[PDB]
Scaffold this motif. Structure first.
Motif, PDB file in Angstrom:
ATOM      1  N   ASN A 441      43.727  -8.284  42.816  1.00 51.83           N
ATOM      2  CA  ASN A 441      43.103  -9.505  43.319  1.00 51.83           C
ATOM      3  C   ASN A 441      43.954 -10.730  43.015  1.00 51.83           C
TER       4      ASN A 441
ATOM      5  N   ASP B 419      24.260  -7.197  45.607  1.00 49.86           N
ATOM      6  CA  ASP B 419      24.948  -6.339  46.552  1.00 49.86           C
ATOM      7  C   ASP B 419      25.878  -5.435  45.766  1.00 49.86           C
ATOM      8  N   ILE B 421      28.466  -3.800  46.394  1.00 52.22           N
ATOM      9  CA  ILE B 421      29.797  -4.343  46.637  1.00 52.22           C
ATOM     10  C   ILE B 421      29.718  -5.833  46.370  1.00 52.22           C
ATOM     11  N   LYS B 422      30.787  -6.411  45.832  1.00 53.44           N
ATOM     12  CA  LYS B 422      30.802  -7.783  45.326  1.00 53.44           C
ATOM     13  C   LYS B 422      30.014  -7.935  44.033  1.00 53.44           C
ATOM     14  N   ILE B 439      29.020 -14.482  40.971  1.00 56.16           N
ATOM     15  CA  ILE B 439      28.863 -14.153  42.385  1.00 56.16           C
ATOM     16  C   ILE B 439      28.973 -15.408  43.251  1.00 56.16           C
ATOM     17  N   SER B 442      32.663 -16.703  43.539  1.00 53.72           N
ATOM     18  CA  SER B 442      33.469 -15.928  44.477  1.00 53.72           C
ATOM     19  C   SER B 442      33.120 -16.268  45.924  1.00 53.72           C
ATOM     20  N   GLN B 443      31.818 -16.354  46.239  1.00 51.22           N
ATOM     21  CA  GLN B 443      31.427 -16.739  47.595  1.00 51.22           C
ATOM     22  C   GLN B 443      32.028 -18.080  47.980  1.00 51.22           C
ATOM     23  N   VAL B 446      35.846 -17.923  48.738  1.00 52.93           N
ATOM     24  CA  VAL B 446      36.088 -17.327  50.049  1.00 52.93           C
ATOM     25  C   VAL B 446      35.761 -18.324  51.154  1.00 52.93           C
TER      26      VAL B 446
END
Ligand SMILES: *[C@@H]1O[C@H](CO)[C@@H](O[C@@H]2O[C@H](CO)[C@@H](O[C@@H]3O[C@H](CO)[C@@H](O)[C@H](O)[C@@H]3O)[C@H](O)[C@H]2NC(C)=O)[C@H](O)[C@H]1NC(C)=O
Ligand SMILES: *[C@@H]1O[C@H](CO)[C@@H](O[C@@H]2O[C@H](CO)[C@@H](O[C@@H]3O[C@H](CO)[C@@H](O)[C@H](O)[C@@H]3O)[C@H](O)[C@H]2NC(C)=O)[C@H](O)[C@H]1NC(C)=O
Ligand SMILES: *[C@@H]1O[C@H](CO)[C@@H](O[C@@H]2O[C@H](CO)[C@@H](O[C@@H]3O[C@H](CO)[C@@H](O)[C@H](O)[C@@H]3O)[C@H](O)[C@H]2NC(C)=O)[C@H](O)[C@H]1NC(C)=O
Ligand SMILES: *[C@@H]1O[C@H](CO)[C@@H](O[C@@H]2O[C@H](CO)[C@@H](O)[C@H](O)[C@H]2NC(C)=O)[C@H](O)[C@H]1NC(C)=O
Ligand SMILES: *[C@@H]1O[C@H](CO)[C@@H](O[C@@H]2O[C@H](CO)[C@@H](O)[C@H](O)[C@H]2NC(C)=O)[C@H](O)[C@H]1NC(C)=O
Ligand SMILES: *[C@@H]1O[C@H](CO)[C@@H](O[C@@H]2O[C@H](CO)[C@@H](O)[C@H](O)[C@H]2NC(C)=O)[C@H](O)[C@H]1NC(C)=O
Ligand SMILES: CC(=O)N[C@@H]1[C@@H](O)[C@H](O)[C@@H](CO)O[C@H]1O
Ligand SMILES: *[C@@H]1O[C@H](CO)[C@@H](O)[C@H](O)[C@H]1NC(C)=O
Ligand SMILES: *[C@@H]1O[C@H](CO)[C@@H](O)[C@H](O)[C@H]1NC(C)=O
Lengths: 454, 454, 454
Positions: A441, B419, B421-422, B439, B442-443, B446
């Protein structure tokens, strides 16, 4: 046995053991009888019989304030375990004791033993226990002691009755002080609670097939070692207590042990270090694998290992692939990482693993010869046939002298695949593939920044 | 009692206990007197009195090389605790012992017991201790033994004196070997250091109200269970030692226990697992809350729980909102996470919590009718009025048979919001809101990359 | 001693100790002789000699099913340690025992002791042990008991033989009990395995200089405290066992202890907390430094500490620079972090470190005077000369009263350097410089986005 040294993960796996697994508890209920001491008096003055008799009466009076459970009012897998075995043992013991303390139960138990000294009885909840009675002190008090003490005289000139009574109340006084010192729940069976003949007679009655019965009858010490006693009460003049024994129901099933030491690779003076975190014992059983992570609950005697099924954790069978290819498996292999080396010696059943890094001097030697040789930096596997003692800078360790076959499995270390710069920070019990994900990453974000030029 | 099963955090909280908290130590100072055995000789040859008397003299000469505090030249809250209670106990004991070893103190103490056998005295630092004297062996040696052994003869034809002497020096020899075998600081009070009558007579003198005194007089076994003895010395022919007893100052104050098991949710074969980390005991006291994280220091005896205030950590009053609203509280409720399920059974006082995932078979049954039913995957709460034994793939656990009221608190699990994943990597004692922060960050990053198109 | 309170790291370091380090084991081989009891019978019925003699015969029969090694068919540095010392001790013991069990070894050992009662012998692997023989019960049985019991009569009118035999078989019955209760490997030397005179004779023979021999001969209790015994077997009528004693080879070498408590800084109601994780003992030896992280393996008696070289970890000599400059050292200083304060008291040898935060009230007082004063929020160092007890909201701790010199070192806390917002999540045993790197990396990424405007 047979031991492999795994160069890749830098660890060792030893196979060829056979399990002896506890799978339940068996309950013996003892009725120790004292007689009518609280009905005998003495009026001569100081004597021997009077001293012993006052000791016996005081023991009965003292034991009536001791209660086992009542108040008289007149993902780190090594942490999820660690407290399961003993808590489960005590919970089961007290659960049965609550059922025996009732008056109907004690009445039935005493009615079983009216004309014999051992009888197999069923409680009210359907559990089958073995009831046994101890009647030496009572018979001595009724038949011999009472006749001699006729008119409250105890300064008599016999002195054989005095020594005999000293011989006869010893077990009673020992039982009383073992329950009184330990709040009513002792942590081990002594030879006063359950002697040897009664241990053999209880093992002969357990609910298992003949093979396990033979194993326990021959190795009784390791069946007594894992029990405990609970006080039920003082009823009339009878001290009633119980003893919980293990049932080693499953025997001769494969086991193995995994040991490990830090694996550190150096470049330009910067280190990258890993350490496998799934050490300890593993036992097969009926096609399922159980991992015992706290090595204080499994005991070897020979090539057999005595284990407690309440202290293990079920693991998938693919967990044996961390010993074949730790790097590219599917299973989540657990590792700890770091950037600072450690020098240490991890002793394994047929040798040792020595990790010698930046500032430490190591050597191997024997008894008759002395310092045999020095060791290179890195990790080495020293079999116990080529050495007797392993020395870190000033510490000396004596290898165990078990006999077996040693093998070495080749492979470049996994720690040598990293770049000591760009290594992630310290981790604690993560999976290896998560370490690789961290590095990937970071690379991806740097590439994302580099692509955007404008 | 009363036990709630919390679905959202997948744990259980049991209330209705009452505390018995240790809040200090009381010190008894024992003076055991041996007499003038050191100037009694024998010249006949082997006999009984000579053997016993040589044992007594050797015990005195042995005890003078045993020292308790001199060398003779003639945020993981479970880790912050774990060693506080015993270190504090020993520190207090040795702090008082340093004050009694002075010659002025021992002179004053021996002057108090000159004409009596128990007296409350005050040391030089203002602490009030209870001094008591043991004078049976000494009186036997002065009055009976010395008169008979008159011309250095001990092969006499009495044999009542030999047996009496064996009876009288038993406590002295036991005290000596208990202190000699344990380096001078024993870890428990036996019936040789302090017998039962002296335990009652010392409990009657503690500095607390009448209610706690009554509780302790009726349950002396659990007051002896938490003490220890320290050797002060051998002065002349007197063996001087001390005994430290707890003072259960605070009684009948609310407590509760919290237990937990992994809570894992599956989507497309990928798991997200969360486990609650604030397990163990909690006790109110005077409007404050104290959390005892190592379950090895709190011991129940029915409705009551005996606790040690030095092993606890003061927690905020809102720490009980993790048992109501674990996701949206402001308080930092501690959790561990993972991506790999574990299957296990967490036994709680009125039942069990079974976590059964991908490859494990579970069932519940009883003692009479055998297996009752199977269990679905996930986590479920099994009361002990519903079953007797819970079975994971081959392990059987016996529930405790306590009586209470069980409730279930509805709610969709927390682990079902993630989720798989993630999901962040493995954590260890982090607050839950930090997981949500990972979480969200990271969102957001992105999204920042996506907004920049150019 | 001398104790510094380090204000920047909020911890304390105490120096001036002297070490007594274990560096090997010494083996004593005991041959306890019983005689021809299995050749004597009785036919009168109940008596005293018959009871004692049946006890002795049953003890021999019972001890032949007890085996010590065979089954009869007839980077968190506190976790890398924790189990090394005891595992290594047992491995060494069993390794020597495997060599003494051979028939050639026992034959040679018994041939050494044919005409004496102690002899220094060498095994077949070159190790030198000390063999000693215990011959009192055997001589009594051959010379006295056998002659009196002539034609299977034991209801004789002697009663001096009965009491004598009770005196003589006590040590034998106690040895058998201790080995039978503990599966054949006791965890401590009692006074029945190796008495006191034999402990002195074994210490006089150890392979060390005169100074260490003198220290051990004067403090024998602490040499017996760290040994154990292993059963070799029953050969004929001889019970053969062994005793492993420590060798305190290295004495009077510098040591120090490091203690710590949380250090938290508040800004706008948000806290940043840091705690120091390299606590416990450190010892010089021959220019190297060894760190003992589990405080349960080092025990002090005075200003002397009895360490165990198998439970320590070699650390670089720059590690002490964490006590001088925790921020800017070139060394991985281990810390834990958090965002939630903890209030607690860490007792150090000459005082206490009190951390008082959000909702906790602290005070210091004495015995004669009572509450002396309150304390401000933060962390403070309370010497044991201006206080006797320290109180957190309702808990009272009694300071130790050792005498030394206290010394405070100035400096602003590290925790005042952080910003409580933008603090990294909870960590566990990371280096401090990694915390700083984390904050710097986040700043750098934010700046990278800010530079890109387009
Ligand atoms: C050790 O010596 C003490 C004292 O020398 C003995 O105690 C003596 O025991 C006699 C027993 O005859 C008692 O005196 C008399 O007691 C009877 C009732 O038992 C009664 O007639 C009178 O009360 C009379 O005083 C008394 O307890 C005591 N005698 C004296 C003068 O103090 C003890 O028996 C001796 N123990 C052994 C094992 O030899
Ligand atoms: C405690 O009391 C019991 C019973 O009163 C004693 O046991 C008895 O001891 C005598 C000793 O001689 C035994 O006598 C034997 O009688 C049979 C039948 O004639 C014969 O073999 C001999 O003539 C012999 O004398 C007796 O069998 C035995 N049991 C009973 C039920 O009487 C015991 O000795 C007493 N113990 C003490 C320490 O006083
Ligand atoms: C166990 O057996 C031994 C050996 O038979 C007994 O020891 C004997 O005790 C006598 C005491 O009269 C000792 O005799 C010696 O006499 C000379 C001259 O009087 C004297 O100088 C010595 O100091 C000693 O007193 C000797 O130890 C021994 N007799 C022998 C070997 O002939 C012992 O009494 C027996 N134990 C019991 C409880 O009966
Ligand atoms: C000692 O003697 C007394 C009599 O003075 C016994 O007390 C009675 O024993 C009978 C026997 O069953 C009972 O039916 C009575 O109810 C008892 N009386 C009382 C007031 O309880 C006493 O039991 C004897 N000691 C022992 C241990 O039996
Ligand atoms: C021997 O017994 C006497 C009993 O009077 C003890 O008392 C001492 O006796 C010696 C004579 O050998 C005197 O010199 C001392 O003055 C006496 N003591 C006192 C305080 O005056 C004597 O202690 C005993 N012997 C031993 C070695 O204990
Ligand atoms: C008790 O007696 C028996 C029988 O005499 C001893 O057994 C062996 O008996 C043979 C004769 O058949 C002798 O030649 C042996 O010397 C005896 N054994 C020994 C060791 O001497 C038995 O051993 C005797 N009890 C003991 C403890 O030796
Ligand atoms: C992706 C990959 O390489 N998987 C293999 C697996 O197929 C094999 O079974 C195991 C050892 O046998 O080693 C690994
Ligand atoms: C969560 O529930 C508790 C229970 O009373 C409540 O006090 C708290 O405000 C809730 N959290 C919210 C609303 O964010
Ligand atoms: C921190 O202090 C130590 C103490 O001597 C010193 O050696 C070291 O150089 C200091 N750190 C830096 C970066 O200078």
């Amino acid at each position: 046995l047979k031991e492999s040294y795994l160069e890749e993960s830098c660890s060792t796996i030893t196979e060829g053991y056979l399990s002896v697994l506890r799978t339940g508890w068996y309950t013996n209920v003892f009725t120790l009888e004292v007689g009518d001491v609280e009905n005998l008096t003495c009026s001569d003055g100081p004597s021997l019989i009077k001293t012993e008799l006052d000791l016996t009466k005081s023991a009965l009076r003292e034991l009536k304030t001791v209660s086992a459970d009542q108040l008289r009012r007149r993902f780190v897998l090594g942490a999820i375990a660690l407290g399961r075995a003993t808590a489960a043992a005590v919970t089961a013991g007290v659960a049965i004791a609550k059922t025996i303390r009732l008056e109907s139960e004690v009445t039935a138990i005493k009615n079983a033993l009216k004309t014999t000294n051992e009888a197999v009885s069923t409680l009210g909840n359907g559990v089958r226990v073995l009831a046994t009675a101890v009647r030496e002190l009572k018979d001595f008090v009724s038949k011999n002691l009472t006749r001699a003490i006729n008119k409250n005289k105890c300064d008599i000139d016999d002195l054989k009755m005095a020594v005999s009574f000293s011989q006869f109340n010893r077990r009673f006084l020992n039982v009383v002080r073992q329950f009184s010192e330990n709040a009513g729940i002792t942590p081990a069976i002594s030879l006063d609670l359950m002697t040897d003949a009664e241990l053999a007679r209880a093992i002969s009655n357990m609910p298992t097939s003949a093979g396990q019965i033979k194993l326990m009858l021959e190795n009784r010490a390791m069946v007594r070692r894992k029990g405990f006693g609970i006080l039920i009460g003082v009823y009339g003049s009878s001290v009633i207590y119980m003893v919980q024994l293990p049932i080693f129901g499953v025997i001769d099933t494969p086991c193995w042990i995994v040991k490990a030491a830090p694996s550190c690779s150096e470049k330009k003076g910067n280190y990258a270090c890993l350490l496998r975190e799934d050490q300890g014992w593993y036992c097969q059983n009926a096609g399922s694998t159980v991992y015992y992570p706290n090595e204080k609950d499994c005991e070897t005697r020979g090539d057999h290992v005595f284990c407690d099924t309440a202290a293990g954790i079920n693991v998938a069978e693919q967990s044996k692939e961390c010993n074949i290819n730790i790097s590219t498996t599917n299973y989540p292999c657990k590792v700890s990482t770091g950037r600072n080396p450690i020098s240490m010696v991890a002793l394994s059943p047929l040798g040792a693993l020595v990790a010698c890094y930046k500032g430490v001097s190591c050597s191997i030697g024997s008894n008759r010869v002395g310092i045999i040789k020095q060791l290179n930096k890195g990790c080495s596997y020293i079999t116990n046939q080529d050495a007797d003692t392993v020395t870190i800078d000033n510490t000396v360790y004596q290898l165990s002298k078990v006999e077996g076959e040693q093998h070495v499995i080749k492979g470049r270390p996994v720690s040598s695949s990293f770049d000591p710069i760009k290594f992630p920070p310290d981790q604690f019990n993560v999976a290896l593939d998560q370490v690789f994900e961290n590095i990937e990453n970071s690379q991806a974000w740097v590439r994302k920044f580099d692509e955007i030029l404008s």
